[PDB]
Design a protein around this ligand. Structure first.
Ligand SMILES: [Ca+2]
Ligand SMILES: [Ca+2]
Ligand SMILES: [Ca+2]
Ligand SMILES: [Ca+2]
Lengths: 312, 312, 312, 312
């Protein structure tokens, strides 16, 4: 089983990633780290513990990370109408899963320096401030990391801006730091995750599993889908999971090796992931971007995982 | 016939545009203005007069414009090996077509203010510094212009940089000015002009015309194709003409109405044409980008024009 | 007499400059050009004609220039409480002085190209967009200009921003263009004009002149002083005039030859005039900044001029 | 005694600071942290241990910090001609003072969280990357810190650039983070440290102390003075110590409370410490800049401290 560390900011997307990681036999979830994002770190951490409780994950540490982006201020942009805990779901009086005592950054450095080299695969699905920190704090980790698979960015697509994606836009500096280290980086951006649609056929499929987790996922997804993408006439889509999926089977998506950098001072482009697809491509490129997604193989994995989790 | 003003920096691309404008009965070439570009203004102006002589264009003024970009310094980047005049073609001792006495900017302002409103269509195919100047000098012109169709930019493609196109990168400021005026702008970028390939089938076709101008076009095209795109294993392509083609028949290419702006201070993005393809598109958009091109219809027009010009 | 061209955006400061130019025998006012600024171009032009009428200036053309900055949008920031025409003074039904038929930019190029080389001294006291245009339109002028003395910028002082002065901040691009041409530039910035205080002693002095123009100057100055600097407990100060003063007598202020450039893309520094006072100064420097001002010599000139104008 | 933590990048300046902190009875040196700078972190750390050995400092932990700036790459710029260890002084086979096991960042967080609130005063005299890290990792520390006194920046002076000082220019981001936290910041910039000259009178004075440390200081100072400032005809100056001096006696220098920020994306201004000295100053300002220095009082403190250290 491939050992990984899931750094996230729990929203349905991140939650589904956690289910997939836990549910799949090919993945060995080493720990779940949390980072500030659209919602405060605390809010996000609570959500993490809630999904951990629902998926009945035990033995896997959960640690809260950075509360602020490296340099940019955070736009709290809070306004969830019918939101209580996560979506319409409320938090239980007590949480089954407890919070690890150390800061997410320390945990990551610890885990990496504890296990054998090229064993752990980092999978960030939120801002990269947590990762960026560990890199500057413990340089020896970038060489020990097998590789980095993150959900974020977009070479020809953007949401937070015409050309930028949230996870990156949120803390451009952290993104830059990460993208410029000597390690291997696989960027699963919007261009990709946009293909991971939640067609009604898929919903029927998951609903068929008929487990508390399945129901949970659907309910929350539906709630948030309504608020965002349900403003238009087209299905919702999950992103974060796509990163985990790749780690499980590289054939779930096509990728292209092209250099990628982060714009940090552009009046209109700050936060954009610049990808050089130009004529002669460099022979050695530690970075690559996801392109086409295998719709079926992807969803099958999700369902399969949900089935495996069952009803804890 | 649609009245237009062709602002360019004569290189084969620009030359073909001139042939198409002149040769087509649907277009009424009001004047040919010139701007500094990859080559000096003078060099470029000489080239204009040469093609004017070859196409036997008479009665149409030719005026030289700005010699430097608004704010950016110009990278002369000159190094043409077997280049004499234009490609391997040399300049005649004297030019048949003479140079208008006024500066291109003035000529433009004059023409626009002379003819009736919404009659002239501006068609820049080089930097936009000439157009930007006229706008700031005589504001009344932006309302009198029917519309602006320019070859330049690229929303998902770039050459001068991973994300920027020459004509824009060369003078970002000028582009910005142009793209931010209240007038209608149709941007024919790389994404489009890339489809305008010069397949051998096409060459055979033009060579079949068998006129001095046809031969001229081929000879020069071949020469420059060799230097640039002939460094790899794929045909060359003409760009500039595409802009002229659109004016002749909007059905030569599909377009999309989306907001566009110019990044002016991005460390990696300066010069990029930022296009917002995001979810909800504004109802009123004076700007649109070219997407798919009608290969056949396009080339047919070019051939047709060459045929019409004949041998002056 | 030193021939000059006064490019301004009439506010009391610019008005006093006009008085000084007109009133002084050492200066030969060739023309008065107008540029957009804190107030619209039209507003500013009207003001110019009004002071021209008051100072009884005849034979000197007045031309309206650019209505918008080169690239930056203009912040109209209009909110003058008791403002009618200029300050509390109202416009007469008709203006004695008429408006020249050509655009300020053209007038400038014409004058320069008409007179003999190194004869005209350009004195801008508003945004530099007017000058910048002329330079790009007719390159031959920068060699024919004796030199450039402008009121604007600040090496250790700022007002529109912690580090930038209005005239420059308003149209950074224009400033940039001007500061990077091969001609001689004397920058009279805030560091200098801040010393030009309107102590009560000075007011008494000017009031003593007892002429319509004197009264006018005082009334307007007082009105505007109240609104701005009169928010604090310290006298008002005139700026623009200091530039003209220098042309009349270089010994009115001390200057330092140091390189100067314009920041165009700094998040906090855009518009700042960067001055390199560092250790080894270049031997050849076409730019210099004003430092210390001769308070008495300065004011004496102003009074003397007012005295000379008299009551037209 | 005022408790402090000295974060530095040992060069003579930093060394003198250490001597002053140690030697002065009013200061309680809690620990000495190290940051990458002009020289590598390791190089810098070795130098710290060397001065520690020379000053006979015992009981005070020494910890190495970050090896790279947050986001900017480091310009190693190494080329010391007659440099062996520190200046012409060589390292002993073994170091008396040992290196604390934890990373400087951790040590700082530990110390702060250990002692009582508003007890420790942070005194960084090198890049601020170390401080910035701790702040992002353990937010609770900014409230517990008494205040921040750092040597770096320049409001009207610069060295690394016409407008920027090294310590800040080296890692702009870090600086920004620090200057924008809710804690009190006292910036001792070039404007100030420039007045701390090492006149021959002073040298004679210190040489009079006649101790190994005094000799050490002089020898190194002389060596580096020769390389840098000795390229011109003016004495050398110590900077870093001035920060320490202020903590010992605020009356050693005059300060002004004015807002300060860090430019991060200016083409010419990146790294500059922007200080708003404009008309109305905010009532509440957690930041202030050093202005005039008490030459005698300063040196007296240095001498006194050297005297107190004696010959370990
Ligand atoms: Ca996420
Ligand atoms: Ca062209
Ligand atoms: Ca003015
Ligand atoms: Ca230092």
């Amino acid at each position: 089983p491939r050992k990984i560390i899931l750094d996230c900011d729990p929203g349905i997307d991140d939650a589904v990633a956690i289910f997939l990681a836990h549910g799949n036999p090919e993945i060995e979830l080493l720990a779940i780290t949390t980072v500030v994002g659209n919602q405060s770190l605390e809010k996000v951490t609570q959500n993490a513990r809630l999904v951990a409780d629902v998926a009945g994950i035990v033995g896997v540490p959960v640690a809260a990370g950075c509360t602020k982006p490296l340099v940019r201020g955070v736009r709290n942009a809070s306004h969830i109408h019918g939101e209580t805990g996560m979506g319409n779901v409320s938090y239980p009086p007590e949480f089954k899963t407890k919070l690890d005592g150390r800061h997410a950054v320390q945990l990551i450095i610890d885990l990496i320096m504890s296990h054998e080299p090229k064993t752990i695969t980092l999978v960030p699905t939120g801002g990269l401030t947590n990762i960026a920190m560990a890199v500057r704090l413990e340089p020896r980790i970038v060489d020990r990391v097998k590789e980095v698979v993150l959900m974020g960015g977009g070479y020809h697509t953007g949401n937070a801006s015409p050309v930028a994606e949230f996870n990156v836009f949120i803390d451009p500096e952290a993104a830059h730091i990460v993208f410029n280290e000597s390690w291997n980086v696989t960027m699963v951006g919007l261009d990709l995750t946009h293909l991971a649609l939640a067609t009604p056929a898929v919903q029927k499929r998951v609903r068929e599993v008929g487990t508390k987790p399945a129901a949970f996922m659907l309910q929350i997804l539906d709630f948030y889908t309504k608020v965002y993408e349900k403003e238009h006439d087209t299905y919702g889509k999950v992103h974060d999971p796509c990163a985990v999926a790749y780690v499980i089977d590289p054939t779930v998506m096509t990728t292209e090796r092209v250099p990628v950098d982060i714009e940090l001072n552009g009046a209109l482009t700050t936060g954009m992931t610049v990808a050089d697809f130009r004529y002669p491509r460099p022979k050695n490129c530690r970075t690559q971007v996801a392109v086409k997604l295998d719709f079926d193989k992807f969803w099958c994995l999700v369902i399969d995982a949900l089935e495996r989790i069952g009803d804890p």
